[PDB]
Design a binder for this molecule. Structure first.
Ligand SMILES: CCCCCCCCCCCCCCCCCC(=O)OC[C@H](COP(=O)([O-])OCC(O)COP(=O)([O-])OC[C@@H](COC(=O)CCCCCCCCCCCCCCCCC)OC(=O)CCCCCCCCCCCCCCCCC)OC(=O)CCCCCCCCCCCCCCCCC
Ligand SMILES: CCCCCCCCCCCCCCCCCC(=O)OC[C@H](COP(=O)([O-])OCC(O)COP(=O)([O-])OC[C@@H](COC(=O)CCCCCCCCCCCCCCCCC)OC(=O)CCCCCCCCCCCCCCCCC)OC(=O)CCCCCCCCCCCCCCCCC
Ligand SMILES: CCCCCCCCCCCCCCCCCC(=O)OC[C@H](COP(=O)(O)OCCN)OC(=O)CCCCCCCCCCCCCCCCC
Ligand SMILES: CCCCCCCCCCCCCCCCCC(=O)OC[C@H](COP(=O)(O)OCCN)OC(=O)CCCCCCCCCCCCCCCCC
Ligand SMILES: CCCCCCCCCCCCCCCCCC(=O)OC[C@H](COP(=O)(O)OCCN)OC(=O)CCCCCCCCCCCCCCCCC
Ligand SMILES: CCCCCCCCCCCCCCCCCC(=O)OC[C@H](COP(=O)(O)OCCN)OC(=O)CCCCCCCCCCCCCCCCC
Ligand SMILES: CCCCCCCCCCCCCCCCCC(=O)OC[C@H](COP(=O)(O)OCCN)OC(=O)CCCCCCCCCCCCCCCCC
Ligand SMILES: CCCCCCCCCCCCO[C@@H]1O[C@H](CO)[C@@H](O[C@H]2O[C@H](CO)[C@@H](O)[C@H](O)[C@H]2O)[C@H](O)[C@H]1O
Ligand SMILES: CCCCCCCCCCCCO[C@@H]1O[C@H](CO)[C@@H](O[C@H]2O[C@H](CO)[C@@H](O)[C@H](O)[C@H]2O)[C@H](O)[C@H]1O
Ligand SMILES: CCCCCCCCCCCCO[C@@H]1O[C@H](CO)[C@@H](O[C@H]2O[C@H](CO)[C@@H](O)[C@H](O)[C@H]2O)[C@H](O)[C@H]1O
Ligand SMILES: Nc1nc2c(ncn2[C@@H]2O[C@H](COP(=O)(O)OP(=O)(O)OP(=O)(O)O)[C@@H](O)[C@H]2O)c(=O)[nH]1
Ligand SMILES: N=C(N)NC(=N)NCCc1ccc(I)c(Cl)c1
Ligand SMILES: [Mg+2]
Lengths: 320, 98, 140, 347, 83, 48, 51, 63, 112
């Protein structure tokens, strides 16, 4: 019984499956803050589902066979190109950013659909609430145009308003000199081209805008790099939270049913990420999009709705 | 017709013109709508009572009950309009111009 | 509108010119008043006097067209000695179009109005001659 | 809205309409309209925003005014005939008042101003109800009182509606406003033929509802409410663009599609009554509708408008909206002309 | 039988006002169908003569219609005098 | 197992399939019975 | 042949349309051998003049 | 097809079409009379049903 | 009758044949609906869900048959009413006196 009003009427109400362990946790930080490692330990210790940070190929991981697709089917967004040539005339910088916000929006919907359907909490690394720090850094460094920022805010305005914020926001605060040292040690040739000014912009946006905003409506825990090493103390901090803020206290079965109907319908989730605002960075001409869409339908198991693809082994198609 | 009907119909016309000629307050227009109901109730009751249409004696009550329910819905819309804008002025309800 | 239209269509064509011109001026004026009423209601004048000015400008314009159509169409029928001729109405309709090209001052509008008001006037005369019904009474 | 409450509210919208259709008493007809208006308001308000609140208020004021005028007509009719039976009215002033009230309820010109605004301000599913189910009750009363309607009044309303609907739609980019002006134009054909053959009124109403439901359902399927948003359909659901093209051409009255049938039949009935100018004027004026229907086909199906990069993410997910009855309605909306003689079932 | 009995004891302890309301409303719906006196309310209402009893023209074949009010034909209110 | 997430229509809904075919069979049997009954009533009423 | 069965579609359509065209003639026999111009007595073995 | 078949098939076609044409003219004439006089099944608009009337003796005699 | 889809008097008429061309078209419309249902949901158009495609045809045919029955009945009633009215009022439908073209004068309009 795929979830709907009928399933809701018959007793599939979110408050039944939810507990005081049903929480949405997001770990934030600058680049190379060990936030990935902290996020895994929190999930393991608290028995939550861990979501690796949503990258360029997150949506591929959730559809088809789950393996990544060729680049042209993500529009040719390259994080490596962003580092090598952040000011490329092709518009890769904002096109990557617009794609990544949509990837995070989809992931936030999956995480919320997991929380509401099973009751198990989730741990995310960054979210649609903190995606803007990279946009602010890009703009302040002159990588993207003012019009791109306006487009981003338009898309964020009509999308983020539908979703509840995280229960707990965890911030791992690492200074830019230490961030810059860990980057050079990580030995990724493109990442080492990152400059401290860009990194300082991310930090400023996090502390100037993100943390004050999330503090009003969420539980914010901030750890230095050293303190994040003590994951057990981090988990201990989380379990002693009062939770006396935000909209999660206003939710009831009727509102959570409306929320679940949204997050399960992924096209409804992504509706406004393609608003017809003709920004050159994200606009694709008819001939190209027609050609790429035709190639996409030729990929294995993509021509038809899932379960109706004989070319990947589906059977009983004439009774389905 | 009888002399009373002249003024009852006049009252309905006066309230209809009041309803169609808005000022600023939505409540003032809702009062005119109730005025039309009251004149309809009187005109119906007079006609029914004078003609001794016995089973029709309940009709004015049904008119009153249903129109009061209508007015309750109208008031609820007024307060929602007032919550949005801080007043019940009709000039604020012009978003759907475009 | 019934009675005014009854006075006009009772007078024989090509005769009693002053009565025909009065009937069309009243018809034209009434149309102007109706247009002014809706215009003032839906596009609120900036002031009381602007609205009065607009009412006069429209009403006078509409009465001007009505007067010229009635006079010119009655003068033509009288002079040509052709009462039941749609051409007379075609002439009067274009005259009205010119007036509307003058009040709005636009040679293009006048030329377009004369053709279309001229054609429309001729069709009205044909309809009267042959009993064309616009709002036909139900019969089957 | 709680799903059980939504169902009960929807059932009450239908019950109000059914009471109007089965009633033989004017009081019960009035009650049906009041019950129907009570239940419709919550579905206009259900998305809680200032535009929805403005739309519901404008709707409430229009419909409550029309219902008071209807009650006045009923009471005048009572004084001059001493009875309540739903049928011809026995007083010309009562007939005018009831006709004007039903015109306001239908959103016919010059009482049309609320239709584009209310439709714009409510969700697509609510607009679908407003422009289809809500026409049933007022039309079913006109069907019964027409022997006493003033011919000049009803035909003036019809002509004005076709003109205002055609002209008003030329200037619209919002899909909900286009459907609203299209509805005003189509109400004009329904009432123009009513004095001559009410069966053709029913035929035009039924075909209008089928075609209108098809358009709204296809708009809902893709969550499109603007012309430009609809122009991205070709890059997501190409099949939908073709179905929209067929439905729009049908709504334009082009043969051999279904939407030609009502115009064809209405012209026939009017000419049988020696009405020649009015049908010809109506048919030419309806070309204005065809124009702004064609404009939509150009930006949706016959050309490929520019896309966005994020559209690729949509390629990986299937349509999940219900699209109830869409396959059936699109076939009826386009392929019914060969069955035209079936209209006699409506007699 | 017992789980319902354990249910009633809980509402009787927690919401005696609501238990009494529902109990009274149930008796108001049920008892009229069980009462042997309910049938008399119909008869008494019909026995009350609000308007004049218009006499029938006698055509010679109405032996069940009294000629005089004090004749023995027609409905009797002896049942009502005892009640 | 190709799909990473099991598709909602991976396997047929046999109850729905059974009802769907059963409904189609019923309508055809009913339609033929109705037509047969209509033909006889017509022949009887017209004396044929 | 699963590779060349589509080539029967149009030829079969012609045969079917031919058959249906002949079927229509059977509904239009009201005046068969009854026109003033061609009416004649039947040949010994003939049942109808045309079909 | 021989000429005789086409010729007599034409006559069958003409007979049907002429019969339909006459009926179309008759129907328009019947509709005109029925609507003008109201004495036929068509254009029969309802009047109050007389079975609704109560004929029993009333509280007062003059009615 | 009154609010009756097929009144009892309709049973005196021949039923539509199950091979009626109009009923075949109705079945064809149901088949087209089945294919569009596959298309809008991105299933193999011709092969997917033959059970669903079968019910589309059956539903259309089933409803179409009764609609065709009512259609033919209404037209039979129209003719019944018309002929009975022509009989009731012989004064309004007299037999026209027919003249041959030898007697009827028609003006000749040369094309030269
Ligand atoms: C029996 C029949 C019924 C009997 C009724 C008897 C009277 C009893 C009371 C009835 C209720 C009346 C309600 C009046 C009302 O509330 O209107 C408020 C209405 C608007 O209220 P407001 O917000 O306070 O603004 C005031 C002005 O509009 C100034 O604001 P503005 O921003 O609009 O300023 C620009 C001004 C510009 O004014 C103009 O330009 C008008 C020029 C027209 C020249 C001709 O625009 C107007 O005045 C609006 C009207 C425009 C004219 C519309 C076409 C006429 O004010 C008026 O319009 C005053 C009119 C009052 C006259 C009442 C006469 C009623 C007769 C009905 C006809 C019966 C004949 C049969
Ligand atoms: C002569 C004039 C021109 C022709 C007139 C044509 C008038 C329309 C004819 C009726 C059309 C009804 C639709 C055809 C049925 C095909 C749908 C189907 O196969 O559903 C199988 C249905 C579910 O199949 P599915 O996988 O959900 O997808 C089917 C469509 O997508 C289902 O998608 P859907 O959203 O469109 O479902 C519509 C249907 C709900 O779907 C149904 O269950 C079909 C029910 C059709 C009832 C047959 C009506 C004829 C009998 C008259 C009484 O709604 C209803 O409740 C029926 C109204 O299986 C059943 O339960 C059979 C019904 C059991 C009773
Ligand atoms: C814009 C063009 C409108 C035409 C101008 C109005 C006009 O001249 O006619 C007024 C019309 C008179 O109609 P009337 O004579 O009363 O009865 C119908 C006779 N077949 O009045 C009417 O009854 C119809 C009113 C028409 C309103 C404009 C449409
Ligand atoms: C029922 C019987 C009613 C008969 C009358 C029917 C007329 C109803 C008209 C409803 C539509 C009104 C909206 C409209 O037509 O536009 C309003 C228009 C405002 O514009 P305006 O001031 O006239 O010109 C300036 C342009 N630069 O101003 C107008 O055009 C108003 C005049 C419209 C009527 C002619
Ligand atoms: C554009 C928008 C406005 C639409 C045009 C305005 C209408 C123009 C009407 C012209 C007059 C036609 C007419 O009304 O004829 C009526 C008359 C009916 O009389 P009846 O009783 O049936 O028979 C005896 C004849 N008196 O006699 C007839 O019925 C005969 C007329 C047959 C039908 C005429 C069809 C319309 C003719 C007007 C269009 C012709 C020009 C087309 C040009 C288009 C070029 C692109
Ligand atoms: C013959 C025409 C048949 C028309 C059938 C139309 C069915 C609706 C179209 C399917 C679209 C998907 C759907 O489920 O309908 C949407 C709407 C519910 O709204 P939605 O936002 O989708 O979810 C509700 C949660 N609040 O659901 C609805 O409210 C249905 C609205 C349509 C009802 C009016 C249909 C026209 C009148 C038909 C009567 C014919 C006489
Ligand atoms: C007795 C024989 C009658 C022959 C005449 C029939 C034509 C008249 C009826 C037409 C009415 C519309 C019929 C319903 C449309 C069904 C076709 C369709 O919608 O799917 C197109 C499909 C595309 O191919 P596919 O790879 O399957 O991709 C599916 C995309 N969702 O296409 C396919 O590959 C599936 C194979 C069948 C395709 C049929 C396409 C018909 C196109 C008709 C266009 C409209 C008429 C002009
Ligand atoms: C671009 C074209 C746009 C559309 C143009 C449409 C034109 C339609 C033609 C106008 C309608 C016919 O016009 C109408 O015909 C009838 C004929 O019975 C006339 O009928 C008149 O006949 C008698 C005597 O002749 C008069 O005394 C009387 O006043 C009036 O009844 C009307 O006075 C006239 O108003
Ligand atoms: C005997 C019949 C007599 C006729 C009675 C007349 C009709 C009265 C109808 C009243 C119906 C009220 O129905 C009422 O619904 C709610 C459902 O949330 C139930 O109450 C339920 O929700 C409340 C919270 O509000 C919980 O604390 C409670 O544990 C739970 O029982 C009531 O147990 C039930 O009584
Ligand atoms: C949400 C919906 C709520 C609906 C609630 C409806 C509840 C109705 C409950 C009472 C209905 C029956 O109530 C009572 O039953 C007895 C049956 O023994 C009826 O019958 C009794 O009175 C009649 C008089 O008419 C006698 O002829 C009869 O001998 C006697 O048994 C009563 O006339 C009726 O007053
Ligand atoms: N331009 C851009 N880059 C992003 C965005 N999110 C992540 N990235 C990049 O993704 C890369 C890796 O992300 P991180 O998780 O922060 O680095 P990490 O060292 O692997 O993980 P941590 O140790 O926890 O900090 C970085 O180079 C980021 O610049 C974004 O929204 N915009
Ligand atoms: N009111 C009208 N002008 N037309 C109309 N309904 N005429 C009645 C004539 C008619 C026509 C078709 C059928 I089938 C039937 Cl049974 C009766
Ligand atoms: Mg990481």
């Amino acid at each position: 019984l795929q979830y709907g009003p009928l399933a809701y009427i018959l007793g599939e109400k979110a408050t039944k499956k939810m507990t005081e362990k049903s929480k949405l946790i997001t770990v934030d930080g600058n680049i190379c803050s060990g936030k990935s490692k902290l996020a895994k330990e929190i999930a393991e210790k608290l028995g939550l589902k861990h979501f690796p940070e949503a990258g360029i190929h997150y949506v591929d991981s959730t559809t088809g066979d789950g393996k990544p697709l060729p680049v042209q089917f993500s529009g040719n967004c390259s994080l490596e190109k962003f580092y090598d040539d952040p000011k490329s005339n092709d518009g890769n910088s904002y096109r990557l950013q617009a794609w990544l916000y949509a990837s995070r929006l989809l992931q936030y919907a999956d995480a919320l659909e997991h929380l509401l359907s099973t009751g198990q909490g989730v741990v995310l690394e960054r979210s649609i609430y903190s995606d803007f720090v990279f946009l602010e850094a890009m703009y302040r460094q002159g990588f993207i145009r003012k019009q791109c920022v306006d487009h981003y805010n338009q898309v964020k305005k009509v999308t983020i308003c539908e979703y509840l914020p995280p229960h707990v926001v965890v911030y791992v605060d690492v200074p830019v000199p230490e961030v810059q040292s860990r980057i050079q040690k990580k030995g990724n040739p493109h990442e080492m081209k990152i400059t401290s000014a860009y990194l300082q912009d991310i930090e400023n946006a996090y502390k100037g805008t993100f943390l004050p905003e999330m503090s009003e409506k969420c539980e914010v825990l901030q750890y230095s790099a050293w303190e994040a090493q003590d994951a057990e103390k981090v988990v201990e901090d989380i379990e002693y939270l009062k939770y006396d803020k935000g909209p999660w206290l206003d939710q009831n079965d009727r509102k959570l049913h409306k929320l679940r109907m949204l997050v399960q319908d992924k096209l409804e989730v992504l509706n406004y990420t393609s608003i017809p605002v003709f920004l050159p960075e994200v606009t694709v001409g008819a001939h190209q999009s027609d050609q790429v869409f035709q190639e996409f339908t030729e990929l294995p198991g993509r021509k038809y709705r899932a379960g109706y693809n004989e070319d990947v082994g589906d059977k009983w198609i004439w009774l389905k | 017709m009888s002399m009373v009907y002249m003024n009852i119909m006049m009252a309905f016309t006066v309230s209809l013109v009041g309803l169609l000629m808005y000022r600023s307050h939505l409540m003032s227009s809702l009062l005119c709508l109730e005025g039309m109901m009251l004149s309809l109730f009187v005109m119906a009751a007079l006609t029914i009572l004078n003609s001794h249409f016995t089973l029709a004696s309940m009709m004015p009550i049904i008119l009153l009950v249903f129109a009061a329910c209508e007015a309750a819905l109208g008031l609820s819309l007024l307060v929602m309009v007032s919550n949005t804008y801080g007043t019940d002025y009709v000039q604020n309800l012009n978003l759907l111009q475009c | 509108a019934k009675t005014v239209l009854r006075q006009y269509w009772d007078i024989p064509e090509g005769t009693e010119c002053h009565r025909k011109t009065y009937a069309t001026t009243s018809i034209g004026g009434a149309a102007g008043l109706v247009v002014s009423a809706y215009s003032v209601a839906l596009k609120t004048p900036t002031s009381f006097l602007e609205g009065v000015a607009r009412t006069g400008r429209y009403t006078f314009t509409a009465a001007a067209i009505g007067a010229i159509f009635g006079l010119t169409s009655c003068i033509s029928a009288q002079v040509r000695e052709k009462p039941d001729d749609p051409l007379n109405y075609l002439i009067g309709g274009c005259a009205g179009g010119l007036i509307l090209g003058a009040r709005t001052r636009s040679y293009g509008i006048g030329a377009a109005a004369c053709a279309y008001m001229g054609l429309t006037a001729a069709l009205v005369k044909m309809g009267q001659l042959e009993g064309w019904q616009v709002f036909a009474e139900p019969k089957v | 809205m709680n799903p059980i409450i939504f169902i009960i509210i929807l059932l009450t919208i239908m019950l109000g309409t059914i009471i109007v259709m089965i009633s033989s008493h004017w009081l019960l007809v009035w009650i049906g309209f009041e019950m129907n208006m009570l239940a419709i308001i919550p579905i206009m308000m259900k998305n809680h925003n200032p535009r929805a609140t403005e739309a519901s208020t404008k709707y409430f004021l229009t419909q409550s005014t029309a219902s008071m005028l209807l009650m006045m007509a009923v009471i005048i009719n009572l004084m001059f005939s001493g009875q309540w039976t739903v049928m011809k009215l026995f007083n010309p002033m009562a007939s005018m008042l009831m006709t004007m009230a039903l015109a306001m309820k239908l959103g016919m010109a010059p009482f049309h101003f609320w239709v584009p605004e209310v439709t714009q301000g409510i969700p697509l599913s609510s607009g679908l109800i407003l422009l289809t189910w809500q026409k049933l009750a007022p039309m079913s009363v006109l069907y019964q009182i027409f022997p006493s309607i003033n011919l000049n009044l009803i035909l003036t309303l019809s002509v004005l509606s076709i003109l205002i609907g055609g002209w008003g739609g030329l200037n619209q980019t919002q899909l909900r406003k286009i459907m609203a002006y299209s509805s005003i134009a189509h109400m004009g054909w329904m009432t123009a033929v009513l004095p001559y053959n009410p069966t053709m009124t029913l035929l035009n109403l039924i075909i209008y509802i089928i075609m209108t439901s098809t358009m709204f359902t296809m708009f809902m399927a893709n969550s499109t409410t603007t012309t430009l948003s609809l122009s991205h359909t070709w890059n997501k659901t190409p099949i939908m663009t073709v179905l929209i093209l067929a439905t729009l051409l049908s709504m334009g009255g082009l043969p051999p599609l279904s939407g030609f049938m009502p115009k064809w039949m209405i012209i026939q009935e009017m000419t049988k009554n020696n009405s020649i100018i009015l049908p010809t004027f109506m048919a030419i004026t309806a070309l204005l509708n065809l124009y702004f229907y064609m404009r939509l086909t150009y930006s949706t199906t016959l050309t490929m408008f520019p896309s966005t990069n994020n559209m690729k993410m949509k390629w990986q997910f299937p349509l999940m909206k219900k699209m109830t009855f869409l396959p059936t309605m699109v076939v009826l909306s386009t392929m019914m002309l060969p069955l035209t003689p079936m209209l006699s079932v409506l007699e | 039988a017992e789980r319902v009995a354990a249910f009633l004891k809980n509402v009787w302890a927690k919401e005696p006002v609501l238990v009494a309301s529902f109990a009274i409303a149930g008796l108001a719906v049920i008892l009229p169908t069980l009462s042997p006196y309910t049938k008399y309310s119909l008869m008494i209402n019909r026995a009350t003569p609000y308007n004049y009893p218009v006499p029938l023209r006698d055509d010679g074949n109405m032996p069940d219609v009294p000629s005089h009010p004090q004749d023995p034909q027609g409905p009797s209110l002896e049942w009502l005098k005892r009640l | 197992k190709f799909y990473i997430q099991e598709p909602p229509h991976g396997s047929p809904n046999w109850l729905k399939v059974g009802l769907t075919l059963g409904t189609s069979v019923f309508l055809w049997i009913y339609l033929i019975k109705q037509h047969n009954e209509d033909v006889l009533e017509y022949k009887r009423r017209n004396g044929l | 042949v699963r590779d060349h069965w589509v080539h029967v579609l149009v030829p079969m359509g012609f045969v079917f349309g031919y058959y249906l065209d002949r079927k229509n003639d059977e509904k239009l026999t009201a005046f068969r051998n009854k026109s003033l111009l061609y009416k004649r007595e039947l040949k010994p073995n003939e049942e109808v003049t045309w079909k | 097809d021989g000429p005789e078949k086409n010729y007599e098939r034409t006559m069958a076609i003409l007979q049907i079409e002429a019969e339909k044409a006459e009926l179309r003219l008759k129907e328009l004439e019947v509709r005109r009379l029925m609507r003008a006089r109201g004495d036929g099944p068509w254009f029969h608009y309802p009047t109050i049903d007389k079975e609704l009337i109560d004929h029993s003796p009333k509280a007062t005699p003059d009615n | 009758a009154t609010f009756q889809f097929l009144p009892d008097e309709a049973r005196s008429l021949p039923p539509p044949k199950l091979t009626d061309p109009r009923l075949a078209f109705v079945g064809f419309l149901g088949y087209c609906s089945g294919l569009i249902d596959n298309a809008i949901r991105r299933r193999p158009v011709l092969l997917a869900g033959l059970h669903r495609q079968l019910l589309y045809i059956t539903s259309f045919v089933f409803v179409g048959y009764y609609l065709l029955k009512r259609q033919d009945y209404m037209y039979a009633v129209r003719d019944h009413d018309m002929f009975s009215y022509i009989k009731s009022h012989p004064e309004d439908f007299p037999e026209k006196d027919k003249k041959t073209y030898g007697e009827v004068f028609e003006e000749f309009h040369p094309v030269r």
